[PDB]
Amino acid sequence: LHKEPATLIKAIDGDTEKLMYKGQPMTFRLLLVDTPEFNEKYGPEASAFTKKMVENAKKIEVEFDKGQRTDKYGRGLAYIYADGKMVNEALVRQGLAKVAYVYKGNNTHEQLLRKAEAQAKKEKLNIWS
Ligand SMILES: Cc1cn([C@H]2C[C@H](OP(=O)(O)O)[C@@H](COP(=O)(O)O)O2)c(=O)[nH]c1=O
Numbered sequence: 585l586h587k588e589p590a591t592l593i594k595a596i597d598g599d600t601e602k603l604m605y606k607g608q609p610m611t612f613r614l615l616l617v618d619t620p621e622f623n624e625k626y627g628p629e630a631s632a633f634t635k636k637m638v639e640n641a642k643k644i645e646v647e648f649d650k651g652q653r654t655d656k657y658g659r660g661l662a663y664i665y666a667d668g669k670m671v672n673e674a675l676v677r678q679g680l681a682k683v684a685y686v687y688k689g690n691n692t693h694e695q696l697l698r699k700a701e702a703q704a705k706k707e708k709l710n711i712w713s
């Protein structure tokens with residue numbers, strides 16, 4: 585897989601964000617994770633965590649996996665990086681997301697994110713508390 589440029593347009597919530605990719609605005613849904621909705625427990629925290637991470641970054645990158653690049657809603661499906669740190673992993677490591685929606689053929693970072701979930705779960709963080 586390879587990283588590609590993008591710039592923040594607007595944070596949306598824990599696992600969706602509006603980015604400019606190849607010069608076009610797109611809503612991106614983070615692969616392999618599920619954050620609570622804003623109205624749910626930990627949803628406000630998930631939203632703030634992603635928003636801070638992507639807004640503070642000097643450099644946003646998108647990384648598509650090997651399979652479908654957009655979902656049935658027109659959202660791009662990617663790993664998003666903020667100054668080289670993967671937002672998908674960082675949410676899971678903090679117990680602000682669950683590993684979820686693992687579909688074969690877009691699951692390259694599955695095991696990395698499960699390792700992070702296991703550690704958030706150990707530490708009883710947030711969703712695991
Ligand atoms: C993360 C992801 C979600 N989706 C679809 C599955 C779900 O369909 P349904 O809308 O029918 O429940 C929905 C979950 O996204 P959200 O967690 O953002 O709602 O997005 C994919 O198709 N591919 C993906 O990789």
Ligand SMILES: [Ca+2]
Pocket residue numbers: 599618619620621
């Ligand atoms: Ca969600």
